[PDB]
Amino acid sequence: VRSEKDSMGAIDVPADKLWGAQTQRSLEHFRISTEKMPTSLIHALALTKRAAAKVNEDLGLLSEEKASAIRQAADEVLAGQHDDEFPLAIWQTGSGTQSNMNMNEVLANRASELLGGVRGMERKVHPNDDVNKSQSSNDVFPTAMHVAALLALRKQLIPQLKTLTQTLNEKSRAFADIVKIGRTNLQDATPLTLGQEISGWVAMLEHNLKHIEYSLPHVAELALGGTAVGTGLNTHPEYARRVADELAVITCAPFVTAPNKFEALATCDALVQAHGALKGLAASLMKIANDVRWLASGPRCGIGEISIPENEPGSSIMPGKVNPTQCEALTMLCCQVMGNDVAINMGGASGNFELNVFRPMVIHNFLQSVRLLADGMESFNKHCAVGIEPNRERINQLLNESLMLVTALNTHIGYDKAAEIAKKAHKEGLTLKAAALALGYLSEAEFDSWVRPEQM
Amino acid sequence: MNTVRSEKDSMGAIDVPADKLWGAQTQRSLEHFRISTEKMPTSLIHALALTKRAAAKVNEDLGLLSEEKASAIRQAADEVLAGQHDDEFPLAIWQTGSGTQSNMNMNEVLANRASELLGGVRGMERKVHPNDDVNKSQSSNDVFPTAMHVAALLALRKQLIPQLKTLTQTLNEKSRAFADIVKIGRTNLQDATPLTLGQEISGWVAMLEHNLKHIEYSLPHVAELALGGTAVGTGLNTHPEYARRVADELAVITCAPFVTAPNKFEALATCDALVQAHGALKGLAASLMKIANDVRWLASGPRCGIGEISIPENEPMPGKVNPTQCEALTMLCCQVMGNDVAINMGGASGNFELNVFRPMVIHNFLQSVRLLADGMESFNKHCAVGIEPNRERINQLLNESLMLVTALNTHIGYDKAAEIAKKAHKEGLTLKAAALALGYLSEAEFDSWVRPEQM
Amino acid sequence: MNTVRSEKDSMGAIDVPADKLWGAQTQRSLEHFRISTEKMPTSLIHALALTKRAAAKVNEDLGLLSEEKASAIRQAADEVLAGQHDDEFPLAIWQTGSGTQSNMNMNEVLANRASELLGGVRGMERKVHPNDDVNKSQSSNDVFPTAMHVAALLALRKQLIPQLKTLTQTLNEKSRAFADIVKIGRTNLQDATPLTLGQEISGWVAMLEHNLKHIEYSLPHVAELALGGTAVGTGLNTHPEYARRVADELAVITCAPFVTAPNKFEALATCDALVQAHGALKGLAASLMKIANDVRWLASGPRCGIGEISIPENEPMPGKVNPTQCEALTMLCCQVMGNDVAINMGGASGNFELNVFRPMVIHNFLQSVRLLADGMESFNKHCAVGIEPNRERINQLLNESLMLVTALNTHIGYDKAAEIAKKAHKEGLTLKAAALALGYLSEAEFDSWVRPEQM
Amino acid sequence: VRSEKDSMGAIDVPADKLWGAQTQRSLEHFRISTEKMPTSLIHALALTKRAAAKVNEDLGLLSEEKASAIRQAADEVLAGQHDDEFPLAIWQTGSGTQSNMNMNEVLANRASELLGGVRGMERKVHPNDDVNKSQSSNDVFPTAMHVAALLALRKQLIPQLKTLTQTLNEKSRAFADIVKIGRTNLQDATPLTLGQEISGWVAMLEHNLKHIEYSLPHVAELALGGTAVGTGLNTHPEYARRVADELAVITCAPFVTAPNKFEALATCDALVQAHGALKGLAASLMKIANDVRWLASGPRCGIGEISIPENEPGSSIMPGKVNPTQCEALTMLCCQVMGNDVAINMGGASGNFELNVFRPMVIHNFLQSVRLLADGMESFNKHCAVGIEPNRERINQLLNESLMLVTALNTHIGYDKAAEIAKKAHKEGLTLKAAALALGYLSEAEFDSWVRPEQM
């Protein structure tokens, strides 16, 4: 072990670790559950420190040697070299201070080594004085939250959403000619094509993309520069804009400094709103997944209008039972996003005065929902959606088995007469044609020429 | 009526419509909280009247109120209970969080009415006083919470439970009636091993029986009353026997096991009893959601769905029977789920000596009880009692499935059985047709060996 | 009225009170769905009337309905809009999930009323027919969803937004007015570095401005109407120009930018536009919750709380001013949160061509709009406009804190400043008293160096 | 790598791993997020397999050599020797089949080695035929869910709840004599003792324990024996009761076989109900945590009636700022439990016919809530509750600064006169005594003898 210290005294930290006294102290005070900061957030925090170092250097507040060393240490984190250096639980200080310090200590200790120094109290780079220069945990954590959120939405969620939409759009086009029985209130209704039904799914996904895009501008606003309470006390006048620009450059995302730092520090409003669009997407996906598994139900005693790829092995003596597992995984994660929204809403509604201190929990839920939806759509697309195929025989069997087509006969025979054969078919368990012919109201030839499902 | 009456309070005089029994404070509240359309539920109004009726009786017993004043207030409360003054409580749910305004609403109405009952008049020259007489030995802080529990316990005991038991009985009868009807099972929405319709329905019965016990376990906490704790729970300004006597009186007149809360601080500072009780209700909502969904899917058709059962057609596409009772029931189950979140939020928000999210909490709670009780009652009489099996459809499905292959194992071995199954599946044949095509058995043998009743 | 009228439908004859305008189907529904007390909101009833009014005009334009029949139906709808028939829609929210029963309720009322308007009579010998005339070119499946969006968009545009903008303006005025008042900051509920009251309030303003934009972004999806998609979205049984013309007509008469939905399948199969729009509302509820809480805590007292501001006392312990407007507002914010869950559940539950959780979804949505609009209106006029700072209290707090020590750093160095702070904290002294005790500076110097205005 | 296979063919699995073909297949098909099965569930599943092996042996369905080998492999899992052998995500098959197979493969491969055999297709113990004998994924997963839930509630949650209650009960007793100002609607109200206020917290915790205990009997019912659809097809008549008894013996918990297996398989009702009591506890804890942090707010511009231990270091120049971090961690996890309840409710309401397939998600949320509440109460107790101390001076200052005590004077002077001095004190900013004396209504001696706060 090694001995690191702070204003409360010294504490032993494992020698093979880059964190310091404050991280070790929190590690012993917040032993709650198993949830830790996700990688995306660790990376966003590293990026925030990297940008702060550059700007501080530009303003002459930090020496080139230290500034470059810090950025290099930050790049190592981004490169996956220090994943084991962030052991803190989500259930910590509500402001995220301890994760801010965790990063400050890891970066300082490593930066020291990079400068021919050593980790520990003999270090050349200081966590608070150097790595956290011109910052406050108060404005740093919210900044990291927005960076991680916007990048996750732009880099993961949106591309996956686009891909699944394209796949489903191809399917609607491919099945544009297949007429099937409609179902309203779960009952047989008027026909529509399989392609039309799928176009509904496509339109839902397209609308969702638009909604998600509308939430991005607010998430792009950064708190950095607000300092402790939003006033900006102890910062160079250009710091907030400069750091926002630097972040935009290195991430290639349109980040801007929050026009009102009081709103930025005192609330998690951008995320409460952005998540609203995410629970909206969860509801749409749930409906799509449900339609797929119900339409694929069977093989003999369900609907069975479509078939989906069998991805897991099944019993030799049970050929036919294909459980819609991708659909099951998708509906389960959709329920999760709904629950996650409630946790975020409660935390978001609970800020007091100058600062909202429910942040770690809010970001934990938000990033998980993005993760679930992005990976969920990817998995559903590759292992299910791309392989949806119609069971043409079943579809036609059902179509010709229903009484819904009697409508076409009305245009060629009085309402009551057409309804009459429908009553007999229904009562006798006969098909529309069998009933029609047996009732002697028409012949096979004229019936078949009158009942054209493809003409709606 | 356009004519007004000038009533007044600590803040001054204000006009009240002459034909109304409320006073100055109710008028002020009415004018300051014009938010939405939700008002106190009738059940809560009655619970408040009962609370005032009990407080009066005890105040009389303790020599705190005159016999005449006490009997007049008691009589006025009975009129409220008889439904003679439903038009006298115009306050919105979105008022003061302690429910103080509704407490005063009852105080003013009962005071003005009791005055007339004593040969007096309503208004500032009334013989009975809202605060001094009707609210004697009480506080809005401890009155509203008490009214909340009185309404909640009575609604659960008199409405919800009986309806739950009735539905359970109906389903139990159906379970026994269809005990011999074998149908195809469905897991993951896929065809599965057989079970009888009676066994499937018995699961619904067991769900409801389990729910009943959970609801019963929540009742004792709701039976605890805050009355007597006054402003902050210390019971400052009350007779030492008051809290106990008023609880006894309420118990006597309601025939419900009401008891004074052992810790008045917990009683005034939280809505914990209701947060927990509602947890049992959202559990019932989840169970009902599943039962209702099973029913509508099982009855889907008439030709392109499952169609194993038929349900009563209540409203006027020959066989298109929309499962409307199931639709009303599933919709209200979602409502109960949302109501739970609103209740949890309000329950988690108490500060120091008092939880001030009470009108909202009771609004949601009583709504969930109404929805579940009436929903079960409607679903039972308009759907459950008339559920009938479509035996022909059930048998058609059973015989067309590949799931009965299992019965052949002991007769021809697993390998041949699996071969028959694979062939039927690949060629779109029934098990019998595939079996006969292969020549592994005769039709007579298939008929004798494949007995779905021995699943 | 005890006297009945015999009305009939496909299912037969049923008695309807003679003094009512509804018909057989509304009576059946009324008797089958006696669940709770929630009925269709007035705003939804009016939206339905508007929808029927537009459908009639277009049917006339397309030569589908006679000029006389069309004008009579149009006139009947206007009466509904004028509030002349609020007693004619008794159906509960807990009915058929497609809203079919409320569609028929409007059809029957408009048919019976239009008949009288044509010199005819109500009942089975009416001149205007519910289905053939009033529901011409329509389906319950596409009518209810349309009425939902008409009500939702109008409520958001005419009620919610204006009230939001007004509150924002009031707070902005307060922000500018108190721009020079320095107060102690509070992070984690602990004393923190100073900021002005004006800056703190500007955060509330920015929150409301941001909320307005989010709400605006949700409007175009709500503006899409399902009318014309008929039973399953294919538009079977309608004129090819119908969907477009009816949307135009509604747009003309409402002055709202209504458009026909580009994909009718998405329109009939989901409530996605409302699930998303409500997401913006629950966001506003979270912001309002924080603003309301800040106000009540800042005004807590009068002696043992924060007491930095004073709020208007609206109802009648000398300085005990309960923050009732804040209490009503925080309670309704919890309601909006719960409503969101109910909406999400119903929205996620569509099956195939139709979402049948509609009455429940619109019930919750319109309630959240009413609550937020009226809540902001009430909070603004009865609280926000009269917020005043307690300058003496604010200054007392500032001077008693240890947070101003920072201003001494540039004059005496960090080490001495920290020493003064530690001493004051350990001994329960003010910074000045500790500074003077140590002799690090004179009172004149402290007074000149510690300028809170330069924070 | 090694080559394992199933009915879909062969697939390579890392040689140094004990899982098989089906686990490897799922690993590639369900790459969703980062959530995996928690240790408590893995252990419960191992325990379920251990019990099944014993009973199967007792009924002669399995040979002693294989049965003992399986139990030994199971014990190794319980001992923490194979944590890295369960890589499957929560977002998998809704029935939990893939986790059931993961355990079957790990146990079979290891059991083979224990019998002088080898892992892989050459194994002496077979995953399906031996380890899963007399079972079905359908009834095995629900059983594992209940075992993990009941044990977590009994072994972790309840003891922590009891401990925190005892600590707070000691505090109420200790501060039974300290009179303070009450607060209703956040406004100054009539006095009560600090001990009384704390007794309220104690009573809340005691009521919650009762509620949690009421939910245990239903959770104790096990699905094992129901088989695929609840009928029990393919099992010895005594199997269900025997396995339930065995489980009771090895865990020392009162497990019983579910009286109705259809209810047990088709729903997650016991957990929906049990979680109801947990969200109830979250609401109570939230209120307690909030009271503590508000009462400790300050040090100069808040309430400051109590002080709590400072666990993290602070600025040298800012002595006094003690952020209530344990309270912040506790309120954050409470919001989480509320959100978790919604996800569970949606999954619980979504069963279809014979089986509810939202199980992995339900158990994931349930176990997390237990974890959060148990660890949260432990942390709050040790690092905050045990160290709550009153700031007697502040408490008295506030008490004597309020106008609420004017009530005592009423009993010694007319309502209006007492109210009169209250008006002056309030208007002039004077204390009750200063106003009373200046108004000449009484003397210091008689005032002090009349205004006795300790007499309520």
From Swiss-Prot, chains B, C:
Annotated GO biological process: fumarate metabolic process; malate metabolic process; response to oxidative stress; tricarboxylic acid cycle
Activity over temperature: Thermostable.
Pathway: Carbohydrate metabolism; tricarboxylic acid cycle; (S)-malate from fumarate: step 1/1
UniProt-annotated site: Important for catalytic activity, residues: E327
Domain of life according to the entry: Bacteria
Keyword Lyase attached: yes
Binding site for substrate: 98-100, 126, 129-132, 139-141, 187, 320-322
Protein EC: 4.2.1.2
pH dependence of activity: Optimum pH is 8.
One GO MF term attached to the UniProt entry: fumarate hydratase activity
Reactions it catalyzes: (S)-malate = fumarate + H2O
Subunit relationships: Homotetramer.
Protein's UniProt name: Fumarate hydratase class II
Organism from which the protein derives: Escherichia coli (strain K12)
